Write a protein that binds this ligand. Structure first.
Ligand SMILES: [Ca+2]
Ligand SMILES: [Ca+2]
Ligand SMILES: [Ca+2]
Ligand SMILES: [Cl-]
Ligand SMILES: [Cl-]
Ligand SMILES: [Cl-]
Lengths: 546, 546
């Protein structure tokens, strides 16, 4: 890594944005239709087109220089090598090992981790098969009809996202996900269910995660109240490494599935944490999900910078955020089954890159992670695209769509879906001028004064950037490949930012203060010494609760 | 409205923010604990506390001057009076009339709308009661067990949000919501259902909404394929005013429920669009939902500026966006049942205020609507609060929480939920200095070298603003009151921005281009000279579809 060169290149990119980057995208496309080919890449059926971004050959040359000066490639090699690149926590970062079916070995501290990874998946598969087949029954001999995952953050969003995304691959048992400490979540989830046919999965590495374990004890009582204490072992599984604590809870060791310190929560869906996903779609589908991620990993590791999809995606995201000054990015998947992808991507991106200090503990040099937000298309069009088109800020779009849906009789609806996806990016680029707006109103034969009055309200600046990702069909493999692409774009951006993508020290202060405030809120102690707002809110809660 | 006074006051606010607004919030609270009282207001049980925002008495006086200069009060009166304040469409704006049980008359174009409003509600209630009781059966004589709403935008987000929010008040029948043109949505929703016990509600004022009516024809074929053509009339209701088209489709007169041009989509959950919510919770609960909104309407209309909750919420929202420069705001409801509130507020806020021209068609003077986003607490803490605490940008928080949950046996979970809510706002304000981070590490007896290595990563800037809203319990009335609060804050901000909150010209370009693109995507027509990216994406789709 070359700090001087990196800084010089950042400055060149800012000068370039100011003086040389394309301003009129209609004109750029008109004069230079070759830009589609130059600013797109494929990996197998996956097409990544960033040609509607405000870039030219000089932009891409500078971005390559940036990737080189940031040592994206060397930092990547360190990750794959099992080096302790999570420096603040002194840990390896090896979510890639979780889906690695090609390497002979991957070493962490002198130990080949691959056999352990594969052994856990094998045990998960045997368990999932048994639950799915009815071979493994509840305490009164019933086939399990419902599974309830209990976890927070990374122990939840991945499982939810993937399970919903793979609905066509999921039959019985039904899958439910509890995460909020709010009692509404566990209460509303368990109330319609029968304990006799329900499996609870408790996802916590330590088995002391306060919110998860509080929910877990509520579920434990729900089982034991109806089926008796002895039934707990037939109605629970644990995703945990705290073998002492899982035994104390009454979960047999053959229903406990572990993972490792080098699996970050927001990168854990590939591990034992994905157990509810594997129960939902079956082990074969879960392994296809792993295989798709693995294909993206091999590509990420091996493709030269100019052909490397995640590197280009990270470079373009960095461009948008740090150089163009866009504070957010909207990720709009044109697939209702990806309804919970944006929320997943919020954790992956924002918790990784929402950082103000570098690896070495110094203040960062520019903006770091942007706000990530979105909803599926077409839904989002009818909620907030008004602002994306006519708002005062430019917000870059990341579009995702499949060439084929899963409904053989509704391909016409899929055609409308695709047309809308392509039309929105086209609209953001081309806009509509006052003359064009005027002409449309004149064609309705409105009075001249009304045309003149309304026309300015129908103007669209255009030149708003977007990129589009197209895959053949959202199947397990394609989903895995998509998530991995985003894991690696986030890695890339973090390296350019100079931050640790793999720690999360920013959650500690809230936890600390929540621990102090619990007995205060519960009426067990005073809010003496705290700020007057915290005091006033505590006082109000107490008054309203009395 | 005084444009020169308004510009002057904005300039004063910018100068005040730079030079005089509080920079050290710990000091601001410790020196002046009275700030909690001065920067909070109540309406009945509803507490609104903005004392953790970066404001003092001079900020608040300037914001009052701003409201006066913008003629917030005159514009509000014009809304309540039925004037055509949606000037670009030449329409009144009277969502407030939909819940108005106190006024003698509300006039639009000389006609009292209140009796029509109340008559539609009465008809909806009779229908809802019949469906709920089993008096109104399917074509083969079954009690309806499932309702499926089909709509886009404002015909979907409100129904979804409110039905989830009021889960404790919803028994039978089950409620489902279809919106995406993606065939996955209607197929996944209808697949498990029995047409014999299913009622489809088609929400489209025109009954020509392309996505909704495509979905509606798919649902109609689903009913007719199993039950026969004649059965359609017993399995559909319409929220529409297109009486000829509704009759042609097969929907009887007594199951069509209308609304008016002065009800905007994103303000429509109070109208006949709320029918599925009314079938879910019952008419008595729906009327309580309206009553809560009405209580907030009367307050908004009648309270003086500095005692007016929506006015002060809009002024603080404007301050954050236009003065402090915060491009987004995070709305974090500490209630799992409000899981779809942020998505609802995105449409309400962003589609209203994501505008670049003033009422008179001139370019706006500064930033308009911000990006609105969020997830419920505590879930969001474990997803993205890392970034909210330690990211490079400050993003203001709007917290919402209840003093009491619906599960007495889980009130300890509710105490944890409230403690986390208060801890997050406290943490955002207070932060943690380097010496404070070091002291925590030193208390764990870590080596000095480790203390110095780690401490900078555990620093929190603090001084990050938030406001908190507390209500006693999320019941129908409280939900109604909360949504109305946000309708009116959006109103208030729009008046300061000088824009039309009530049009949405920005959705037209995308629709236009999607209509054109459909036959090109389908292959029904050849190419016709679009940009190389659109062409490239089309060619890829054709290639992958065979
Ligand atoms: Ca399925
Ligand atoms: Ca203190
Ligand atoms: Ca800003
Ligand atoms: Cl996590
Ligand atoms: Cl004109
Ligand atoms: Cl009609």
């Amino acid at each position: 890594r070359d700090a001087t060169k990196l800084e010089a290149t950042v400055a060149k990119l800012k000068k370039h944005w100011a003086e040389s980057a394309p301003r009129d995208m209609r004109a750029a496309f008109s004069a230079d239709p070759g830009r589609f080919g130059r600013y797109s890449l494929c990996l197998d059926d996956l097409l990544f087109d960033w040609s509607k971004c405000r870039v030219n050959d000089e932009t891409m040359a500078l971005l390559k220089e940036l990737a080189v000066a940031a040592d994206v490639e060397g930092r990547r090699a360190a990750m794959f090598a099992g080096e302790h690149i999570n420096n603040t926590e002194d840990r390896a970062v090896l979510h890639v090992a979780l889906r690695d079916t090609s390497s002979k070995e991957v070493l962490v501290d002198g130990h080949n981790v691959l056999p352990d990874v594969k052994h856990v998946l094998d045990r998960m598969a045997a368990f999932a098969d048994g639950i799915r087949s009815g071979a493994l029954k509840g305490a009164t001999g019933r086939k399990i009809t419902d599974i309830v995952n209990i976890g927070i953050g990374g122990s939840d969003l991945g499982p939810v996202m993937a399970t919903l995304a793979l609905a066509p691959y999921h039959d019985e048992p039904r899958a439910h996900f509890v995460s909020n400490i709010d009692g509404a979540h566990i209460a509303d989830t368990l109330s319609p269910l029968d304990p006799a046919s329900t499996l609870i999965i408790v996802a916590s590495k330590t088995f002391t995660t306060i919110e998860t374990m509080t929910n877990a004890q509520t579920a434990r009582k729900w089982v034991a109240d109806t089926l008796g204490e002895a039934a707990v072992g037939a109605h629970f599984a644990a995703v945990s490494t705290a073998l002492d604590k899982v035994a104390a809870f009454g979960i047999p060791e053959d229903r406990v599935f572990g993972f490792w310190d080098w699996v970050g929560g927001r990168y854990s869906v590939w591990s034992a944490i994905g157990l509810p996903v594997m129960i939902a779609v079956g082990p074969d589908n879960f392994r296809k999900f792993l295989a798709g991620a693995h294909a993206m990993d091999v590509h990420f590791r091996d493709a030269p910078l100019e052909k490397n999809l995640p590197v280009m995606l990270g470079l373009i995201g960095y461009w948008h955020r740090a150089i163009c000054g866009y504070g957010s990015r909207a990720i709009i998947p044109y697939d209702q089954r990806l309804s919970r992808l944006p929320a997943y991507l919020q954790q992956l991106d924002m918790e990784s890159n929402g950082k103000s200090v570098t690896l070495d503990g110094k203040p960062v040099s520019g903006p770091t992670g942007p706000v990530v937000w979105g909803e599926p298309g077409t839904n989002g069009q009818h909620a907030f695209f008004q602002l994306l088109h006519q708002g005062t800020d430019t917000i870059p779009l990341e579009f995702i769509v499949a060439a084929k849906g899963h409904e053989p009789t509704l391909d016409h609806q899929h055609e409308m879906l695709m047309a809308n996806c392509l039309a929105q990016s086209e609209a953001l680029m081309k806009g509509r001028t006052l003359d064009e707006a005027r002409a449309q109103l004149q064609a309705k034969n409105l009075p001249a004064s009304q045309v003149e009055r309304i026309a300015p309200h129908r103007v669209f600046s255009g030149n708003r950037p977007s990129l589009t990702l197209i895959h053949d069909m959202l199947d397990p493999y394609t989903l895995g490949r998509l998530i991995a692409l985003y894991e690696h774009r986030v890695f890339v951006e973090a390296q350019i930012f100079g931050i640790n993508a793999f720690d999360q020290w920013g959650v500690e202060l809230g936890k600390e203060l929540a621990t102090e405030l619990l007995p205060v809120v519960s009426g067990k102690e005073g809010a003496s010494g705290r700020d007057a707002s915290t005091q006033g809110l505590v006082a109000h809660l107490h008054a309203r609760r009395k």
